């Protein structure tokens, strides 16, 4: 439990710098400093930036799993579910642009040395999206659809990052995806 | 002779690229090889990233030219053989296709006119093979789904999360999903 209320705070000061400056400052000391831990200690558990926003995105994907009951994502069909959950998700990201514009660098350039943390964000995004979808245990092409939908949010991203693309656009982008494969 | 000297800068801009990778896409190496002056060169194009999306946008304007009806008796099996084939000439140029990768992750609002130009004829082209002729808007739609995911699951191999093998299962999913007969 020592170790989890350290990651907590480590976590947690991740995303208050994150959502106030972006992903510039989010620099290692700044983070160790704010969480009130040793930078080894910080280092040994996180060992860049990359790691720190990426696990923190994952936590925050388990928070909003954990309150999300079968019976909480609205909808009779996969595709109304599917929406439902795409629609909140999107909401979240145009209320925290600077939190967005940081996950969205962060996972440029994320590479081989963050898999394990880049894995466990995909695996809790894609369940969340086809347990959406699915009425039970989901089938293996409602995990193959979810793949495709956050494919289809992270060249958008990549497009709004370099400001080639608008808000309107990356929504866009994303509702045809859906009807596209499940309308 | 505009248009000769413009193909001989994305001659030379693929040929660079295809040997040694993006890093290699030199202003004045291009310039050298293509036997035009610098300044010429960046009068046409001003960096790197609008060198290989222009002459990206060349090859597909090539294999549309070049392209009566593409095999398959339905559309599935048209931009199943299509995504097919570029997968292939995918893997057999990792270099190019690193240095395309590069130019899109680090194209900006400056190319942004040349990124959506070369957009448009790709996903036309791609939507073309679905139609065998003249498409729907759902089949350019799909065609820009297929063109996200293959820039995302790109991203991954260039990074080392994914595989080349990764990557062209990850499309004939897509395709299935989207068009599956």
């Given at each position: 439990?020592?170790?989890?209320?350290?990651?907590?705070?480590?976590?947690?000061?991740?995303?208050?710098?994150?959502?106030?400056?972006?992903?510039?400052?989010?620099?290692?000391?700044?983070?160790?400093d704010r969480a009130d831990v040793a930078v080894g200690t910080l280092y040994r558990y996180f060992p860049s930036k990359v790691h720190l926003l990426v696990s923190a995105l994952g936590r925050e994907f388990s928070r909003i799993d954990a309150k999300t009951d079968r019976s909480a994502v609205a909808g009779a069909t996969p595709f109304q579910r599917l929406n439902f959950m795409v629609g909140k998700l999107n909401r979240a990201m145009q209320r925290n642009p600077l939190l967005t514009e940081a996950m969205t660098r962060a996972y440029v350039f994320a590479d081989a040395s963050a898999a394990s943390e880049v894995d466990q964000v995909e695996k809790?995004?894609?369940?969340?999206?086809?347990?959406?979808?699915?009425?039970?245990?989901?089938?293996?092409?409602?995990?193959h659809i979810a793949r495709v939908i956050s494919d289809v949010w992270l060249s958008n991203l990549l497009a709004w990052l370099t400001r080639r693309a608008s808000a309107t656009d990356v929504s866009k982008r994303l509702d045809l995806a859906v009807r596209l494969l499940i309308g």
């Open positions: 439990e020592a170790q989890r209320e350290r990651r907590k705070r480590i976590l947690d000061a991740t995303m208050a710098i994150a959502s106030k400056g972006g992903y510039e400052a989010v620099q290692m000391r700044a983070v160790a809790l995004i894609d369940s969340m999206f086809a347990r959406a979808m699915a009425n039970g245990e989901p089938t293996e092409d409602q995990y």
